[PDB]
Ligand binder design. Structure first.
Ligand SMILES: [Mg+2]
Ligand SMILES: [Mg+2]
Ligand SMILES: [Mg+2]
Ligand SMILES: [Mg+2]
Ligand SMILES: [Mg+2]
Ligand SMILES: [Mg+2]
Ligand SMILES: [Mg+2]
Ligand SMILES: [Mg+2]
Ligand SMILES: [Mg+2]
Ligand SMILES: [Mg+2]
Ligand SMILES: [Mg+2]
Ligand SMILES: [Mg+2]
Ligand SMILES: [Mg+2]
Ligand SMILES: [Mg+2]
Ligand SMILES: [Mg+2]
Ligand SMILES: [Mg+2]
Ligand SMILES: [Mg+2]
Ligand SMILES: [Mg+2]
Ligand SMILES: [Mg+2]
Ligand SMILES: [Mg+2]
Ligand SMILES: [Mg+2]
Ligand SMILES: [Mg+2]
Ligand SMILES: [Mg+2]
Ligand SMILES: [Mg+2]
Ligand SMILES: [Mg+2]
Ligand SMILES: [Mg+2]
Ligand SMILES: [Mg+2]
Ligand SMILES: [Mg+2]
Ligand SMILES: [Mg+2]
Ligand SMILES: [Mg+2]
Ligand SMILES: [Mg+2]
Ligand SMILES: [Mg+2]
Ligand SMILES: [Mg+2]
Ligand SMILES: [Mg+2]
Lengths: 110, 111, 64, 95, 204
RNA sequence: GGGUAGGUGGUAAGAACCUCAGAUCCGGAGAUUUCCGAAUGGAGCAAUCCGGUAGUUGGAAACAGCUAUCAUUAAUUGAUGAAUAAAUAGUCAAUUAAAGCAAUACGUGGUGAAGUGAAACAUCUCAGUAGCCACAGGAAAAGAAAACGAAUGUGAUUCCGUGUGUAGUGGCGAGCGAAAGCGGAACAGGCCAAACUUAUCAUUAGAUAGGGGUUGUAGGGCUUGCAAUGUGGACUUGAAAACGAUAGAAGAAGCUGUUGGAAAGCAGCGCGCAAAAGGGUGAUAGCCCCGUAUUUGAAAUUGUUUUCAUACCUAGCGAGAUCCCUGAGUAGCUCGGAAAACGUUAUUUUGAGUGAAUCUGCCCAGACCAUUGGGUAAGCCUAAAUACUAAUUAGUGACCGAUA
RNA sequence: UGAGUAACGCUUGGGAGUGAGAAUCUCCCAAACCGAUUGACUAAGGUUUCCUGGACCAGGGUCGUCCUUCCAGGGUUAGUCUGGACCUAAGCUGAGGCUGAAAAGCGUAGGCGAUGGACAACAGGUUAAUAUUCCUGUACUUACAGUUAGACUGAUGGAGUG
């Protein structure tokens, strides 16, 4: 039943499905470990659907990791705060580094 | 197929309860019993336990429920016949739908 | 092992009968004596063989 | 890459003690066969902020429910202690 | 037990004794072996009996028999009244599959035997699975209806072809007989009676 | 494919879902199959550690992901190549196989004791048993007479009964114990070497690849004719059919009253049977239920048999020549052992030595010789009957019933 | 049965509290022993015996509200510490190879093998339980890339040191 619907789908759409379900599976497991998962059966349905998707992808001699490595799309949104924190950290590091060398140099000069 | 399904009227032919008509609410095939409403009323002595949000109250006194009964003691009840009687069933297959249908053997009533 | 390289004939285990018919297990070993022959362009290669095989090589013109 | 090396976050007294005061420290449980570099890469590809450093704990299996009719052993855990830079605090739940 | 190197030893000699015995040239003879063995015969000078042996072989093959079974049947027929040269012919022809092949519902005698063993065959005062039962001159052999349910039918035609010592009506599947096969219906493939004397010497 | 109306494995209730677009469940065929383990990239204290190479994706690189591959031995082929010209040793690469395990069981071979008995003990027995090791197979081994053996004889091997505890063999003590013959189970006999001939190898072939041949009342080759186109295999590919195996479908016949918590017991009146095997149902049910007898059914995988065709083998009786071939460190013999029932001996085998002949030939018939007769060693393969059950299905028990 | 007998395996008094029950549990004050040790840090071994809360089936040679016992939860953070990614000693393994009825034994090249050699971090603070590991402060070492200046770079081998 379900295998027919996925069989109708092409290969590229299937690898998109696997990444989305992998991500969703991680979220369900994290929410369950934090006690915020009202529906505890969705873990099995994603895993079974994930296992089913693997079966259709392995009929043809195609993998799921290599096929997604050839073409993919990058990430976004998780950039602004990251660079703010990183810029602050390197600035603090450079201030300590510059201060330390100065103290040593003038001490050796004296 | 099966002699007793979920929903059809059924009666008891042996035991303390004789001629007890009821509706099968659930069938356990593995242990061969059957829950029939209104029959085999048992009264568990409901204690009090408080360890959950619902268990904080868990109001349970003399709740009367249903005890399972062996399927051998059950017998199908006839409804189509003008004079209802208790009999045995066949497993004829009508070519109209090619589906197996239960038919009594002391009459010609389907199911 | 103490065996020929041309054939596979090896030692022979038997009994050591003496006066009073006392039984003691003994071993007859074959006379493995070095021998050189000419095979594959006459290439001599020393091969430990039984004197019996040595006589066979000599009569078969092989031993030259 | 496959992201099976991030099994479950854990919240204890030690975790909440670290998870306050500027730099936050989040403690997860990871694949016992995974390495520190794999942990950093998994965190990069699924959260987006580079860990400052990673520490690892191995908790040995031990006997549990001793004396009960059927005794059982524990389960092998590898713990990872990520520490994000100053001023950044992301939520473990909600994406 | 080391680098035996058959090349090293074989070439080491190139003839020798072990070399030639093993000489890989060793072919297959995998067709020479079978056929010649298969089955032979002819007559010789010193024992005479050669004729008896060859004739015995032919007769057994005509009906697909093992020599042991033949010795049993000869023992059975031997004791009775007298010059029973009319009895053992009926005994050899009373085989159920033999009657099935002369009845005409099988292309060949062994194929008929296969049918019999597969449970096609219905008798009178009994039924039948074993393809060796000795039938009585006047006996019926009603054929199953399941076999006809598998119309290959080609058979029924052979049935009518028949041989006079068999009376079978085609399609209707039924058979019996009387006036057991005379020697005419037992053709010159094997028509001699000193095979009887061969078994008298070999079987008491 | 079957099959339904339930299911989410047990100690197990509850929560939350799935399921009539046909779920769970059963059967056939597939997919995935972490690490250790013959373990085989290297190591190692098992389930751990450390990598190389060729790709591909991020990085500015180190590096990090994702793939495939990387042990040893043997055989074949190719390349390279020492002492030392050539050539080999050696080195490298490619392809194909081998490794290991278990069925507390059967087979073969090698090795091989002792407790014990002899009322002690050494010959002997135990016993070629236990054990150790190697190689398998679905069985293995054996196998087509240089035989038995005393006759107007039988005509591969194997297994069973008898011959018989007989002939014999034994510090002639303890003991051991056949081979003929007869009655049975099954039955099958095949193929090379050499002659002769063909083609090719610096044709010094003495080698390679073909035709010819497979024996004992001798066979085959040489030359010359007649009759033959078949019958049969231990047989290859296919096609068709039948019988099964791995899920299943249908499958008859009872009410009343009494004791009783409860009837199926008991009693009355009936009914069915190709079903009166069994299990459950509140006691002891042919007719309450599941089943059983019987009739049936397979998409897929697999087993046996049959039919047809098709490769590959397979063929008789004469004449003349008087020529050639028929398995050599072999059979014998000597010196030490052994196998056979035999404690070594006619027969079989072998560690050391020696060593023949070629159908008017050689071996055998319990030392040996002659006559008579039997048989063709020193080359190979061989189904069946025979040995066993860890496992799958069905079933049985004057077998056990928690110290068995 | 012996028999409620032998034995209970080196350490005192009191006040307050908990508790249904206290010589035995908690706190306080003393008291008595150790003090080249019954003190503190670790190797080996042990393998959760560590911390918190609860319980008093069983174990504790008595008792117990208590325990190293049981239940539930939690606890072990390394570029610099101890060992691998570095090296070898005794010894082990060991392709070829030698020897040996078989199994196997010996052994070369290689490879393992610390109890040794080489190698960069110290002070303080913090939790009930971890700290040269977490935090603060101040450092050091080894790789890779870009860049500036100078310089010809110089090993799988030789030598010195080690
Ligand atoms: Mg002895
Ligand atoms: Mg660590
Ligand atoms: Mg289906
Ligand atoms: Mg003795
Ligand atoms: Mg004695
Ligand atoms: Mg004695
Ligand atoms: Mg064999
Ligand atoms: Mg059938
Ligand atoms: Mg049915
Ligand atoms: Mg029925
Ligand atoms: Mg019954
Ligand atoms: Mg002789
Ligand atoms: Mg002997
Ligand atoms: Mg002769
Ligand atoms: Mg000969
Ligand atoms: Mg027991
Ligand atoms: Mg007991
Ligand atoms: Mg006592
Ligand atoms: Mg007492
Ligand atoms: Mg006393
Ligand atoms: Mg006293
Ligand atoms: Mg006392
Ligand atoms: Mg004490
Ligand atoms: Mg005291
Ligand atoms: Mg003191
Ligand atoms: Mg101390
Ligand atoms: Mg414990
Ligand atoms: Mg504590
Ligand atoms: Mg406590
Ligand atoms: Mg106590
Ligand atoms: Mg640090
Ligand atoms: Mg090392
Ligand atoms: Mg050390
Ligand atoms: Mg501490």
């Amino acid at each position: 039943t379900v295998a027919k619907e996925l069989r109708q789908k092409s290969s590229e759409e299937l690898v998109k499905l696997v990444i989305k379900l992998k991500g969703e599976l991680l979220e369900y497991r994290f929410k369950l470990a934090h006690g915020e998962l009202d529906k505890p059966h969705l873990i099995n349905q994603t895993r079974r659907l994930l296992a089913t998707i693997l079966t259709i992808l392995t009929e043809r001699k195609l993998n799921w990791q290599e096929e997604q490595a050839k073409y993919k799309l990058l990430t976004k949104k998780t950039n602004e705060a990251a660079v703010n924190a990183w810029k602050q950290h390197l600035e603090a590091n450079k201030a300590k580094l510059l201060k330390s060398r100065a103290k040593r140099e003038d001490a050796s000069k004296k | 197929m099966q002699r007793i399904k979920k929903g059809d009227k059924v009666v008891v032919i042996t035991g303390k309860n004789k001629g007890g008509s009821g509706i099968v609410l659930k069938i356990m095939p593995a242990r061969q019993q059957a829950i029939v409403e209104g029959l085999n009323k048992v009264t568990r002595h409901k204690k009090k336990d408080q360890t959950t949000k619902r268990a904080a109250k868990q109001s349970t006194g003399k709740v009367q429920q249903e005890a399972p009964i062996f399927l051998s003691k059950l017998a199908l009840f006839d409804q189509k016949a003008k004079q209802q009687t208790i009999g045995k069933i066949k497993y004829v297959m009508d070519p109209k739908t090619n589906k197996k249908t239960r038919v009594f053997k002391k009459s010609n009533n389907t199911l | 092992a103490k065996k020929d390289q041309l054939t596979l004939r090896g030692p022979l285990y038997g009994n050591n009968r003496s006066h009073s018919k006392t039984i003691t297990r003994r071993k007859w070993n074959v006379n493995l004596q070095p021998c050189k022959v000419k095979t594959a362009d006459g290439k001599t290669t020393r091969i430990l063989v039984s004197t019996r095989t040595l006589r066979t090589l000599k009569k078969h013109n092989r031993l030259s | 890459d496959v992201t099976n090396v991030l099994l479950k976050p854990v919240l204890t007294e030690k975790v909440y003690f670290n998870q306050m005061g500027e730099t936050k420290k989040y403690v997860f449980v990871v694949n016992p066969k995974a390495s520190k570099t794999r942990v950093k890469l998994a965190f990069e590809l699924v959260y987006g902020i580079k860990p400052l450093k990673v520490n690892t704990l191995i908790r040995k299996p031990t006997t549990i429910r001793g004396g009960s009719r059927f005794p059982g052993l524990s389960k092998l855990e590898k713990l990872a202690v990520i520490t994000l830079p100053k001023g950044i605090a992301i939520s473990v739940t909600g994406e | 037990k080391y680098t035996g190197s058959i090349f090293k030893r074989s070439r080491r000699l190139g003839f020798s004794l072990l070399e030639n015995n093993k000489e890989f040239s060793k072919g297959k003879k995998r067709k020479t072996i079978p056929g010649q063995h298969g089955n032979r015969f002819r007559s010789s000078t010193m024992s005479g009996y050669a004729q008896q042996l060859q004739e015995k072989q032919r007769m057994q093959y005509m009906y697909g028999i093992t020599d042991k079974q033949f010795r049993r049947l000869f023992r059975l027929v031997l004791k009775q009244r007298g010059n029973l040269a009319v009895n053992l012919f009926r005994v050899l022809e009373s085989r159920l599959d033999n009657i099935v092949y002369r009845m005409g519902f099988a292309p060949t005698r062994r194929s008929a035997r296969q049918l019999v063993n597969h449970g096609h065959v219905l008798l009178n005062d009994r039924t039948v699975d074993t393809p060796s039962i000795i039938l009585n001159p006047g006996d019926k052999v009603r054929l199953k209806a399941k076999t006809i349910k598998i119309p290959i039918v080609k058979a029924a035609s052979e049935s009518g072809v028949v041989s006079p010592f068999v009376e079978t009506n085609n399609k209707t599947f039924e058979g019996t007989y009387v006036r057991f096969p005379e020697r005419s219906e037992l053709p010159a493939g094997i028509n001699e009676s000193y095979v009887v004397e061969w078994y008298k010497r070999l079987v008491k």
